Amino acid sequence: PHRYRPGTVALREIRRYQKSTELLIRKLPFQRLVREIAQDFKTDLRFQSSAVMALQEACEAYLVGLFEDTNLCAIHAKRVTIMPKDIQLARRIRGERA
Amino acid sequence: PHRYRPGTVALREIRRYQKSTELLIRKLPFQRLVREIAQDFKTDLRFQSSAVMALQEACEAYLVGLFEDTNLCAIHAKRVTIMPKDIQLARRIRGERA
Amino acid sequence: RKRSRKESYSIYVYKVLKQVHPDTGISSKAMGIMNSFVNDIFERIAGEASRLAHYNKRSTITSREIQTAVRLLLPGELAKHAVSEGTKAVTKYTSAK
Amino acid sequence: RSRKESYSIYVYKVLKQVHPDTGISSKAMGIMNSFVNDIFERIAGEASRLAHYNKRSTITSREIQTAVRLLLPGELAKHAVSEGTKAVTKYTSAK
Amino acid sequence: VLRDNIQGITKPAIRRLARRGGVKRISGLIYEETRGVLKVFLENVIRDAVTYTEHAKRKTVTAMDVVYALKRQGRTLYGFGG
Amino acid sequence: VLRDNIQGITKPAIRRLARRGGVKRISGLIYEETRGVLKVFLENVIRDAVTYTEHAKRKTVTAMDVVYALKRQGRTLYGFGG
Amino acid sequence: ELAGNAARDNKKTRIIPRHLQLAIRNDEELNKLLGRVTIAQGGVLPNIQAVLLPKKTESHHK
DNA sequence: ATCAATATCCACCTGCAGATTCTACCAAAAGTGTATTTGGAAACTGCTCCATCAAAAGGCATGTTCAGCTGGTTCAGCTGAACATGCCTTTTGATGGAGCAGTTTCCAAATACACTTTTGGTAGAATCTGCAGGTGGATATTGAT
DNA sequence: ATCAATATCCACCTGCAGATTCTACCAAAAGTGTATTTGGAAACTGCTCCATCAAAAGGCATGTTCAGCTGAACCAGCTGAACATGCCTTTTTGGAGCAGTTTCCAAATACACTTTTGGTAGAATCTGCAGGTGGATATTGAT
């Protein structure tokens, strides 16, 4: 069987998703997560669908930016593999203490 | 002659300056730098002395914070020596693009 | 005869200081820092309350807006205790007419 | 029936001024509207703070200009300022 | 059976996002960390959104509530009105 | 002879600051980078300060001008009034 | 203007958010102005770090 | 190290759904024209703090020398990913319907604004004092052959 | 292992910073009036929940493969500290502007009337876009 080397398909996927703008997270589990969390603050709340879409947009843009910083930290550390400590560093430097 | 190992005095200096709050930059060269730069925007400008002190406070707090982030990046990179690339990374992550 | 008049929150901070720790002073620089702090949080709260009111087409800023602004700006238990104190104060004011 | 204002028509006129042969999506128009709203609020708020700082009760074109110089970088600010100046002078001329 | 629903932000979706982030190689432990990071981020936003909601005496969370919550966190979003 | 005066932010002062920053070991090339970083930072602050100055029709830079310049850069300073 | 330039680059007659995001991120001054702004449906720039791409040992000289 | 085989991307029509542009009607928003007002430009005064660089004390910056110690590098083993495929599952979507909840809107009292008077708190001058700082000494901490 | 430098403890003696009294004078509240505003009642249509059913694309366990991570070793050069000293920082008069006062005047609000143009319903076209050919660019596994 024909076999591609590790990385080629990853790179193709990078190019594909970086060329496009469609949302990569599933709508329904995101709605369910949001509803669960909001439920923990106030009961029987509702949400507009576009509010959920907005939240998804914000979440995904935030996550790619964090992964970008993570990637730079990894490269800085002479690695190509991202680790929790890289994320923790990036978030610490932005002041996203949590 | 008696001789201390590398790092002991550095650590003592760290403890000393981290215990105190006095300004570490000389007043006069700072005034001269400020006056030169401001001169490049508008001529024959004056400055209140407390304005210069304020600028110095801001500058030094900014610099220690950048060096702190730099230090974390170095440690992250398994180093104890700070490098330009560490500063560049920290500033890039804060968005201090310049 | 000429003269001006510069207001500050200094005396109230000193009164509070004397209330919590009677045997302790405060430098003028530190008091200035406390006054700067007070001014900053005041501006933050009024601005946020104003924005909420505009969002809700409301021309009045109420204790609800202060509370909400606090809830947005202040964290957890700090917010809860401040809120409780504010509520206590309004309740004491409203009765003491 | 209610009434919702937007900058849509002005953006569309401008689009035809700069590129007669080109359209724009509604979502994009909304983005442009959001942009406009954001810069409006930023400028007015900064102007407000300056006036407060200068114990001034009036917001003039001076405060707008200054706010712009603070907020916008280099050539963008210079061209915007030049345009605003030209516009005010044209307004003041054609009474 | 469901698993607190946070698991619906699946590994491949995170992988896709990281790819958009330009990530070529990813440790297996990253995913849970990302989920935790998201929850914190989300909590704060939604918390504020509900606060705005509560102020308006409304039981329906609007897009504007989200927009304001995002703005106050320095994460301005364009495209949804306002 | 003087050297554009940026050199008055000497190596030992930077060393002291880094020590307060907790730095134990420092490359020799860091110092010029720090100076450059400072100039950029400073330029922006002073630029805005002068803008405020110019708005007031004043020829003397005040502390308040600095404070406002710092605030708009998200670098709020306490202790100098306002 | 910039968005229409990106459209023509993509052989498109209608301006979309993609072009606005591309325009913003490709302009230093707008990028500074909108560095902390999220454009819904904007996506990201095709920016890949040089070190992650495959080697000059790519197998096709010609 | 890259050439003869793979095989994803592009090229380019091409119909066509459906976005998008155009066309018409309302009333709400802008603009003209008049009266009043008040914020601010400009003279013009009192002060206050800030530019000016002279020369000495002294203490911090520069530079030399040397040690050590750590950051760069290579090799190698393992393990934690990458990735194909089978096949299950859990989204998607449409679509349809109940009910709720946003929205309007109409109305009377609540709440706060605005104008006028009497306080009395606070700003600020002027006085007094007590604790932070200097300055020295004795003593517990801490680190190199 | 301790003794040579370090930093902590203790003591004491001032002065100047800061805590405290004495004014007056600015504003903070008491008291009419009025004008806006909020909340409450009742209609009421939009929309979001909900469930339920039929694709559909993707999730997900399994296993094969090998390149990335990371540890051992080591070299070498670069950075840290003492010592010497130079030198540049700190310490010790007027007048350029910075704030306060009057004042009077351009310019900005307030009110009434009239126009205009942008919201909004409804009709119509053009291009984004799914899909069917055709060839080229990007990868490997023999060349």
CA of D26 to C1' of H22 (A): 16
Chain B CA closest to residue A91: B93
- How would DSSP label each residue in A10-35? HHHHHHHHHH-----S-HHHHHHHHH
The residue that minimises its CA distance to C1' of I119 is D3
> What is the rounded CA–CA span in Å between residue D37 and residue D23?
22
> What is the rounded CA–CA span in Å between residue D64 and residue D72?
12
Q: Which helix (H) or strand (E) holds D32?
A: helix D26-53
Of A20, A58, A71, nearest to G43 by CB-CB distance is A20
Nucleotide nearest to D58 (CA to C1'): H39
> What is the rounded CA–CA span in Å between residue A27 and residue C32?
52
D69 within 8 A of F44, measured Cβ to Cβ? no
Could you tell me the resolution of this structure in angstroms? 4.8
Residue in this structure with the two tokens 């790092």, named with its chain if needed:
B7
Nearest of G42, E16, G61 to residue A9 by alpha carbon: E16
* CATH code of residue D19: 1.10.20.10
User: What superfamily does domain A1-98 belong to in CATH?
Assistant: Histone, subunit A (1.10.20.10)
Which residues, in sequence order, are CB contacts of C50 under 8 Å at separation 6+?
A: C61
- The Cβ of residue C84 has, within 10 Å, a number of other Cβ atoms equal to 10
Domain of residue E19, residue span: 3-82
Report helix angle C28-55 to E30-56, nearest 10. 70
**Total structural domains in chain C?**
1
**Total structural domains in chain F?**
1
D64 within 8 A of D44, measured Cβ to Cβ? no
Over its C-alpha atoms, chain E yields an Rg (Å, rounded) of 16
A6 within 8 A of G28, measured Cβ to Cβ? no
CA of E26 to C1' of I139 (A): 23
Buried b (16+ CB within 10 A) or exposed e, A25-46: beeebbbebbbebbeeeeeebe
Both tokens of A67, joined, read 């992964």
Of G13, G20, G32, nearest to D22 by CB-CB distance is G13
Q: CB-hemisphere CA count at 13 Å for G29?
A: 11
Both tokens of C61, joined, read 């800023």
Q: Which helix (H) or strand (E) holds F26?
A: strand F25-26
How far are the Cα atoms of D71, E21, E28, F74 from residue G32, in angstroms, in the given order? 10, 20, 35, 15
- The Cβ of residue B22 has, within 10 Å, a number of other Cβ atoms equal to 5
Q: Which of residues 26-65 of C touch strand I (CB under 7 A)?
A: 26-29, 58-60
Q: Residue F36: is it exposed, middle or buried by C-beta count within 10 angstroms (0-12/13-18/19+)?
A: middle
Which residues, in sequence order, are CB contacts of G20 under 8 Å at separation 6+?
A: D28, D31, D32, G3, G39, G42
Interface contact F51-D69, CB threshold 8 A: yes
Q: Please list every residue in chain G followed by a chain break, i.e. its C lies more than 2.5 Å from the next written N.
A: none
DSSP SS3 for D16: helix
- The Cβ of residue G29 has, within 10 Å, a number of other Cβ atoms equal to 14
Contacts of E82 in chain D (CB under 8 A): 34, 37
> What is the rounded CA–CA span in Å between residue B13 and residue B17?
6
C69 within 8 A of C52, measured Cβ to Cβ? yes
> What is the rounded CA–CA span in Å between residue G52 and residue E25?
10
> What is the rounded CA–CA span in Å between residue C32 and residue G48?
50
* CATH code of residue E46: 1.10.20.10
G36 within 8 A of G61, measured Cβ to Cβ? no
Interface contact F50-B45, CB threshold 8 A: yes
C71 touches chain E (CB under 8 A): yes
> What is the rounded CA–CA span in Å between residue C73 and residue E44?
11
Q: Where are the alpha helices (H) located in chain B, listed in sequence order?
A: 8-19, 27-41, 49-76, 84-94
Residue in this structure with the two tokens 């509560």, named with its chain if needed:
E54
Domain of residue D2, residue span: 1-95
Domain spans, chain A: 1-98
CA of F42 to C1' of H132 (A): 35
D69 within 8 A of D77, measured Cβ to Cβ? yes
* 3-class DSSP string for D40-87: HHHHHHHHHHHHHHCCCCCCCHHHHHHHHHHHCCHHHHHHHHHHHHHH
- The Cβ of residue B28 has, within 10 Å, a number of other Cβ atoms equal to 10
